[PDB]
């Protein structure tokens, strides 16, 4: 019965795929910004307060003088509502030097 | 060796799975539905006429 059962098997290749897929079943490799990103996708959104208020001189495409008082919500928004985000971020010449 | 197996063929094979399943679904749907519906309706109307 030993010589019965222990006939060799050429071609029972083990799989490599279910282990590799359970790895990302646990991990989830590109998933780690799909967990905490919010609102609308955006690559460059970020700028600082000294550079916006002082050196920048503030928002450009907005209303320069008009602050219009709206109907339903009781508010003078078109200055406050922008919260300026114009243009490129704070660049001042350090990537050049380094 | 672990970096070579787990970085350069892993992602290639997974993206090839998803590309091939999209192509298989599209080709199967268009070919089977167009051929079967067109041939059946046309020869049914010819026989009845």
């Amino acid at each position: 019965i030993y010589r019965k059962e222990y006939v060799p098997f050429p071609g029972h290749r083990p799989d490599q795929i279910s282990r590799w897929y359970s790895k990302r079943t646990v991990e989830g490799l590109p998933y780690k910004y799909l967990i905490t990103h919010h609102q609308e996708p955006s690559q460059r959104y970020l700028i600082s307060t000294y550079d916006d208020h002082y050196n920048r001189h503030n928002y450009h495409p907005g209303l320069p003088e008009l602050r219009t008082w709206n109907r339903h919500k009781l508010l003078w928004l078109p200055e406050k509502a922008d919260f300026p985000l114009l243009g490129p971020p704070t660049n001042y010449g350090l990537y050049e030097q380094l | 060796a672990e970096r070579k197996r787990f970085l350069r063929l892993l992602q290639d094979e997974q993206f090839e799975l998803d590309m091939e399943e999209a192509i298989q679904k599209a080709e199967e749907n268009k070919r089977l539905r167009e051929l079967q519906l067109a041939q059946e309706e046309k020869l049914a109307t010819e026989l009845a006429k």
Binding site: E27, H38, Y45, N91 | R3
Partner: protein, 427 residues
């Protein structure tokens, strides 16, 4: 304006710092080939905080990466970030400790400490001005709790001046993973009290809530859960790395949080969480972030914070905001319920500001709390401890490599007198 030395150990910590040393790589625009391909000249400002330099303009971290098993060190540098970590900053043995504290703290995890001690002073003396020492590990085994909390007693022998901050993982209450947890949990709590200052307590029962009840997935796992902890880390030191309105740091945080030589056990949080369906249906503004960071369901420990009081509350903020709407909503939440604060301190909530959130968020916050319902995490260990010591179970792993019963029966008299302090001030 300092650098940060950050220690990692255990089978845990190199699967947590693997997510930590890649959010810092995300926020400074660090590609995994070593160089910098960010967009501004703001990110390049305080790159020194986390990234030493070499030739060619590449930045390699200050990473300390230690474990007895070579099981997980084959997995951290086989990630996407494998050429960003340092080659000679992997220190290991060959054997594995595995759930005992004798051969972590005295023999088998111990002969490699002189191979962690003489890698720190290679780098932590080459840093020009350090703020202190960080650590992340699990108390639940034998390489974090065996080597790191041994080394926490060792590196505080040299420098008492700096500040110890910790990212600890206490064992979960309900379903545990090892039969010998309330020894390794017991003995390292009595370790932690004398030599650590802001000790942060993290659980996995409290995080398998958040990826289920809050963010609404159906398969929460470790990689989904390691990143919310690794969101907290870069959300802590936001002002030593970026400008803002009111900058804070790890010495500003300790003054406004811990009053006492012994009342120094904490509890963390992280504010802006939602699902993937309601991504555009929410408005990420201040009346939404403040509404949930104080809630019990958005908390990373085994605390029902209503059952006790917060003696003190910290915070931080990020993002281009205004200050009046963060001046009154932490003034309303101190006012609307005086039941959940103690009366003898006049203020509780500290406010800190930055200018930039993590990449993808719009505005952010990170809740840090010294509540006295954190003593409901150290009552179940002392309930589990002496209901094991009474039958003297498993003690021949604990006499067999150099410890006594006198390292045992005094390792609960620290846990008793801790809770004997936190109950004085409960009402």
């Amino acid at each position: 304006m300092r650098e940060i030395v950050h220690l990692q150990a255990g089978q845990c910590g190199n699967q947590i710092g693997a997510k930590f040393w890649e959010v810092i790589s995300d926020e400074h625009g660090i590609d995994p080939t070593g160089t910098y391909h960010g967009d501004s000249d703001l990110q390049l400002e305080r790159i020194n905080v986390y990234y030493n330099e070499a030739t060619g303009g590449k930045y390699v971290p200050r990473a300390v990466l230690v474990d007895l098993e070579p099981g997980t060190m084959d997995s951290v540098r086989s990630g996407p970030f494998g050429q960003i970590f340092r080659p000679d900053n992997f220190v290991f043995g060959q054997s594995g400790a595995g759930n005992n504290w004798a051969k972590g703290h005295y023999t088998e995890g111990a002969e490699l400490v002189d191979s962690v001690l003489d890698v720190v002073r290679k780098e932590a003396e080459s840093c020009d001005c350090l703020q202190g020492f960080q650590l992340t590990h699990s108390l639940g085994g034998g390489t974090g709790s065996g080597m790191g909390t041994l080394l926490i007693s060792k590196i505080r022998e040299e420098y008492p001046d700096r500040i110890m901050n910790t990212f600890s993982v206490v064992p979960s209450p309900k379903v545990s993973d090892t039969v010998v947890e309330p020894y390794n949990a017991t003995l390292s709590v009595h370790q932690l009290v004398e030599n650590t200052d802001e000790t942060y307590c993290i659980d996995n029962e409290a995080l398998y809530d958040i990826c289920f009840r809050t963010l609404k997935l159906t398969t929460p796992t470790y990689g989904d859960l390691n990143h919310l902890v690794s969101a907290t880390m870069s959300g802590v030191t936001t002002c030593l790395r970026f400008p803002g309105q009111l900058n804070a740091d790890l010495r500003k945080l300790a003054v406004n949080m811990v009053p006492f030589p012994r009342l120094h056990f904490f509890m963390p949080g992280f504010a802006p969480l939602t699902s993937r369906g309601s991504q555009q249906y929410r408005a990420l503004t201040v009346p939404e972030l403040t509404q949930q960071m104080f809630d019990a369901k958005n908390m990373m420990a085994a605390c029902d914070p209503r059952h006790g009081r917060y003696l003190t509350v910290a915070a931080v903020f990020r993002g281009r905001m205004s200050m009046k709407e963060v001046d009154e909503q932490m003034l309303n939440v101190q006012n609307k319920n005086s039941s959940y604060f103690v009366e003898w301190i006049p203020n509780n909530v500290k406010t800190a500001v930055c200018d930039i959130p993590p990449r993808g968020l719009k505005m952010s916050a990170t809740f840090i709390g010294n509540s006295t319902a954190i003593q409901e995490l150290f009552k179940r260990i002392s309930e589990q401890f002496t209901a094991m010591f009474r039958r003297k179970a498993f003690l021949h792993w604990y006499t067999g490599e150099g410890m006594d019963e006198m390292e045992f029966t005094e390792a609960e008299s620290n846990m008793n007198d801790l809770v004997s302090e936190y109950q004085q001030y409960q009402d």
